[PDB]
Design a binder for this molecule. Structure first.
Ligand SMILES: Nc1ncnc2c1ncn2[C@@H]1O[C@H](COP(=O)(O)OP(=O)(O)O)[C@@H](O)[C@H]1O
Ligand SMILES: [Mg+2]
Lengths: 578, 471, 154
């Protein structure tokens, strides 16, 4: 293979010479230690390599060897309940081989070669096979991991192994062509795994948060973006989605963020319970971690590794939720590499191809028909960190044109400790109309009417605050004061949610429906009582306001009695006030 | 080895950069010695090497150098610091040389100053509550052992006095936490970058009066010292702190005097090399460079010691959206922000609670740690104060006499809050006293307005009077 | 027919080919590599010594040893016919609905000539769009350019 020597070292970038015949985006070994690198520019006899590890201590003249293959991940059993770095190395074995610090040049297999799995075949000799078809089944933490033919492999079965226990290296199916299929295979991270047909979004993604589940829904195959300044609530929202959503498999990508949050996930999750399985919550989670003090060039690789793993779990018939902790650090890394290449920058110094990468990353999401005929889906939620809270950032504007949902956060709401601090005035969802047939079947026949009625009250309150800031709240009429008070009730009681409370952290759909029904019934009764001459300040002294104001903290199995008690108290209040 | 290799043939000197041609044997990131024609030796570091030529940045000033008599010799391939337990009680300059007149340290180890990343598996959750004696911090922005909690300050505001008071009054509370284990006092590692004589003389006297110099290591880079030395100082300080914490089970408190000077020193070198800038001319890799400094704190599983950081930085023109505060807040676990408006009124310490934040508060408070009503009281105070501030804003438009009684209650609450809870002077308060004052303040409001507090806690604690404590 | 193998530089979307002065400016070329895959491209700069080609899609797998470039067409042209009604295309005329490609009645350059201002006439007949707020108050006339200004969630 191609072998050369180092010519120039400067930070994360190494230029090697004598590399004629090397191909673009192949993986190289740099130096005597063997640091992993990637070719990004060919110029005559030389090549430009970005190194995925720290380059301090290197000297000019050390050998460079090209493997001739692009970056690839190993896909197979044994990936759940594990934590990986940016280029898929298990951290809990680096912890064994090294101290408490991460060093250079550690070579670990991604999948354990010593664990033995219970193999059960499905194909028999003489069968025709094709990419995407199932070969066998292996149990894993209550799942049934299905061994798949690689997407580009075709042939006829010659012999299979019987039922028994084998490692992932043992060949189970041998074809007439001579190829041997193992329990795992490798796939390049920059190539999207092929599908058969894309489907329509018609099933909601339940997050457990009232505002996101009701006002700004997202479908099972949709994409959403959550931008905001620092200390607004992105990380807590994404971890709540990891804890409480109804997805089968959750993939978490910590691109360029703190290590303490990864430690928090690693510690807290094994004590929790899966909402649909009953086992530990960590048995369905894959963590890809690349903290801020880890090397810069590995930030780009972690996103592709995570999305490739999420696509692999889609092909088995699962629904996967993918959370990207910060996609702004990816853009910052691309800007940092571009300074060494001496290219002409675009606006804000980013390389001109930034918008193509983001568009190609969000395009992988959706509900598909797999090559094996099953039905799976991948949904992506990506956080954006604009500099200084400037929403006109190029990354924010590029993300805004391709996502189907947009959950904007506000710093002013976060200052006063009003969470989740979603800015209602600048947020939207494009999946609201397509999910209406599902809500009528599963929640209630009148649910869209209630949601629209709540939206009308919020819009009317928003249109009246321009007068309160001008002449004070006490200059308005009685009905306007009632509208303001009901808007305050909605804002304080329905939208607000404490993620650290024992009961309020998770809210089902029917509980939110009941709360909306209670609020609308109170609003209509108060509006009727206004016409009878009753003053507005008399109405807000009623004890039924406490019942609505504390319906959040009622347990899930105690809510049906509380709702029917409150609906009777509503009649008991206004029929005796005047 | 004993051998040393000389390099003549310098071809370009300008500003902080020096160029040497036939030097392909210098490793990237190595430390060099630059010898003048008069025999004076200055330091340097290789920042780009090639088989054609090499680029060296110079720490000291370039006065007196020339292209005919200057020579460059290699010191070591990787920048290292000799660390020892003997460093406690010593003073060093920005590059680790003694300035107290004592003989140098006999090393036990030689550790790289760039450091290595901590493995996320090897960490653990910081949960030990630290009592600083300031009500605005202990109750609403609680600090735990192993946290990074910078202080956001202005030009004329007293951040140094607050830092000294925190270092003087900080202690854990074993009786509340149920551990029962007493502690030795904190070891303080102090790193100054571009500090003036007026502040340094205050810090030295404050450390002398409390007897903390016997447990302290000081790294001093003054304002009349060379600028490029500021790149090394936080790395030296954090290397010593990490060695002491994770090798000898010390509890280390780290104070960095001004990160604004560090960012200016970084911008000078970045503009010399013509990097692609970010906002306001700062280099595009400033987020990564700052990340390697802050992320060296925390707690390690299976080890007793810990590192706690209190960086101090000044916001230019009191702007929170300047690149330095923005990139600092995107990394750290919170911040403490001072208010000039509170400082004008004589309130000390002038901590503004609304923009302040502590991310690790939920780990170290609650039942069995401080008290069962900590978090709900903290939330209710925030909501009531925000309502009071909004009513203050509305009064300036519509006038005070048009207010109802409900708005006047919140106005008086905000006034009493500022005059009694934030303003405490130099006195030391336990957590119980702070919670008692907070409950006394909340008793002014109607009982039905305490939405965020559970009814059992309200029945247990409501009904205090503030005037009995002082009158 | 002719194929140029003098590649000297590959970075991002651009590549340089030496001794390629025969290529016209704006010409469409195809890039063939060692795996047999064929990519598209466009010449954006011609000189005496080399030409610059902007490549469609990614540049993964290309190398300076085996890559070759051939000429497809001097200018970008489109084959048009009355059988295009009822068809879907991908943006460069390639059908995507699965039907056989249309036979071209003519081949026309996609960069059209300007209209002579003296050959125009005044628009005087309207179009019924079926929307009240457009048909009544903002009526659209045959030959008008009337954009719609929208927002993010609209
Ligand atoms: N739903 C919520 N309930 C309670 N507290 C919250 C909620 N969301 C955010 N917070 C608070 O806001 C802070 C924001 O933290 P984090 O989300 O990690 O920062 P960022 O949004 O900059 O990533 C946290 O310390 C947390 O205590
Ligand atoms: Mg975060």
């Amino acid at each position: 293979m191609i072998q050369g020597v180092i010519q120039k070292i400067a930070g994360p970038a190494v230029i090697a010479k004598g590399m004629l015949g090397a191909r673009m985006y192949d993986i190289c070994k740099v130096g005597e230690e063997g640091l992993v690198g990637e070719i990004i520019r060919l110029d005559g006899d030389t090549a430009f390599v970005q190194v995925y590890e720290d380059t301090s201590g290197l000297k000019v003249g050390e050998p460079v060897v090209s493997t001739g293959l692009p970056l690839a991940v190993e896909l197979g059993p044994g990936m759940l309940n594990g934590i990986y770095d940016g280029i898929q190395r298990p951290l809990e074995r680096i912890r064994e081989k090294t101290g408490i610090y991460i060093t250079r040049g550690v070579v670990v297999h991604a999948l354990d070669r010593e664990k033995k799995w219970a193999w059960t075949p499905m194909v028999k000799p003489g069968d025709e096979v094709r990419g995407g078809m199932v070969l066998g089944t292996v149990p894993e933490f209550g799942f049934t991991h299905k061994i798949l033919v690689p997407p580009d492999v075709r042939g006829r079965v010659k012999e299979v192994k019987p039922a028994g226990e084998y490692t992932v290296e043992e060949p189970v199916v041998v074809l007439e062509d001579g190829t041997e299929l193992k329990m795992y295979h490798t796939w390049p991270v920059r190539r999207a795994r092929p599908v058969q047909r894309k489907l329509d979004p018609n099933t909601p993604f339940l997050t457990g948060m009232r505002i996101l589940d009701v006002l700004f829904p997202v479908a099972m195959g949709g994409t959403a973006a959550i931008p905001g300044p620092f200390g607004s609530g992105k990380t807590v929202t994404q971890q709540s989605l990891a804890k409480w959503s109804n997805a089968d498999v959750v993939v978490y990508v910590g691109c360029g963020e703190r290590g303490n949050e990864m430690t928090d996930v690693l510690v807290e999750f094994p004590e929790l319970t899966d909402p649909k399985t009953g086992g530990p919550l960590m048995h369905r989670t894959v963590l890809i971690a690349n903290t801020s003090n880890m090397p810069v060039a590995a930030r780009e690789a972690s996103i592709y590794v995570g999305v490739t793993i999420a696509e692999y779990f889609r092909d088995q018939g699962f629904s996967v939720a993918l959370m990207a902790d910060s996609t702004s650090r990816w853009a910052e890394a691309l800007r940092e590499i571009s300074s060494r290449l001496e290219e002409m920058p675009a606006e804000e110094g980013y390389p001109p191809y930034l918008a193509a990468r983001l568009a190609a990353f969000y395009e992988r999401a959706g509900k598909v028909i797999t090559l094996g005929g099953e039905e799976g889906a991948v949904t992506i939620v990506g956080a954006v960190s604009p500099p200084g809270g400037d929403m006109s950032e190029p990354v924010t504007q590029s993300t805004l044109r391709i996502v189907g949902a947009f959950w904007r956060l506000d710093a002013s709401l976060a200052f006063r400790r009003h969470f989740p601090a979603i800015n209602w005035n600048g947020s939207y969802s494009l999946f609201t109309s397509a999910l209406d047939p599902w809500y009528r079947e599963n929640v209630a026949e009148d649910y869209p009417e209630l949601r629209d009625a709540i939206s009308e009250l919020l819009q009317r309150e928003a249109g009246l605050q321009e007068i309160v800031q001008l002449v004070g709240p006490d200059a308005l009429q009685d009905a306007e004061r009632l509208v303001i008070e009901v808007g305050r009730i909605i804002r304080e009681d329905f939208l607000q949610q404490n993620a650290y409370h024992e009961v309020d952290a998770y809210c089902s759909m029917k509980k939110a429906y009941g709360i909306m029904k209670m609020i609308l019934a109170f609003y209509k009764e108060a509006e009727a009582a206004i016409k009878r001459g009753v003053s507005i300040d008399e109405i807000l002294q009623l004890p039924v306001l406490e019942r609505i104001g504390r319906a959040r903290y009622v347990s899930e199995e105690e809510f049906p009695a509380y709702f029917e008690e409150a609906m009777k108290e509503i009649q008991g209040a206004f029929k005796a006030l005047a | 080895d004993l051998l040393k290799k000389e390099y003549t043939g310098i071809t370009y000197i300008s500003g902080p950069l020096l160029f040497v041609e036939n030097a392909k044997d210098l490793a990237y990131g190595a430390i060099v010695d630059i010898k003048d024609g008069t025999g004076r030796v200055r330091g340097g570091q290789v920042i780009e090497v090639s088989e054609e030529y090499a680029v060296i940045q110079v720490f000291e000033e370039t006065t007196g150098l020339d292209l005919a008599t200057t020579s460059v010799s290699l010191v070591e391939d990787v920048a290292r610091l000799g660390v020892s337990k003997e460093m406690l009680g010593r003073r060093f300059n920005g590059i680790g040389k003694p300035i107290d007149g004592l003989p140098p340290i006999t090393p036990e180890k030689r550790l790289p100053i760039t450091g290595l990343p901590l493995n996320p598996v090897a960490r653990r959750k910081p949960e030990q509550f630290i009592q600083t004696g300031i009500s605005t911090i202990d109750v609403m922005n609680t600090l735990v052992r192993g946290q990074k909690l910078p202080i956001f300050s202005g030009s004329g505001l007293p951040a140094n006095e607050i830092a000294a008071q925190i270092a003087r009054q900080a202690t854990v509370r074993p009786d509340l936490s149920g551990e029962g284990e007493k502690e030795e006092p904190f070891a303080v590692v102090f790193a100054a970058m571009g500090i003036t004589q007026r502040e340094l003389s205050y810090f030295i006297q404050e450390f002398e009066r409390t007897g903390a110099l016997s447990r302290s290591v000081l790294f001093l880079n003054k304002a009349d010292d060379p600028t490029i030395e500021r790149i090394l100082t936080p790395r030296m300080a954090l290397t010593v702190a990490e060695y002491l914490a994770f090798e000898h089970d010390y509890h280390v408190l780290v104070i960095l005097t001004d990160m604004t000077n560090y960012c200016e020193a970084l911008r000078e070198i970045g503009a010399a090399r013509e990097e692609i800038p970010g906002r306001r001319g700062y280099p595009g890799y400033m987020y990564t460079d700052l990340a390697t400094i802050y992320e060296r704190a925390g707690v390690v599983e299976g080890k007793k010691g810990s590192v706690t950081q209190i960086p101090i930085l000044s916001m230019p023109d009191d702007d929170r959206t300047h690149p330095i505060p923005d990139l600092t807040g995107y990394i750290t676990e919170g911040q403490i922000q001072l208010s000039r408006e509170l400082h004008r009124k004589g309130i000390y310490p002038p901590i503004d609670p609304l923009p302040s934040l502590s991310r690790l508060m939920n780990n170290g408070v609650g039942k069995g740690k401080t008290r069962e009503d900590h978090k709900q009281v903290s939330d209710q105070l925030y909501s009531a104060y925000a309502n009071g501030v909004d009513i203050r804003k509305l009064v300036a438009i519509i006038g005070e006499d048009a207010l109802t009684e409900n708005d006047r209650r919140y106005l008086q609450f905000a006034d009493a809050f500022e005059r009694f809870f934030i303003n405490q002077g130099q006195q030391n308060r336990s957590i119980e006293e702070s919670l008692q004052i907070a409950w006394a303040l909340l008793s002014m409001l109607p009982q039905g307005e305490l939405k965020r507090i559970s009814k059992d806690h309200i029945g247990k604690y409501y009904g205090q009077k503030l005037e009995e404590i002082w009158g």
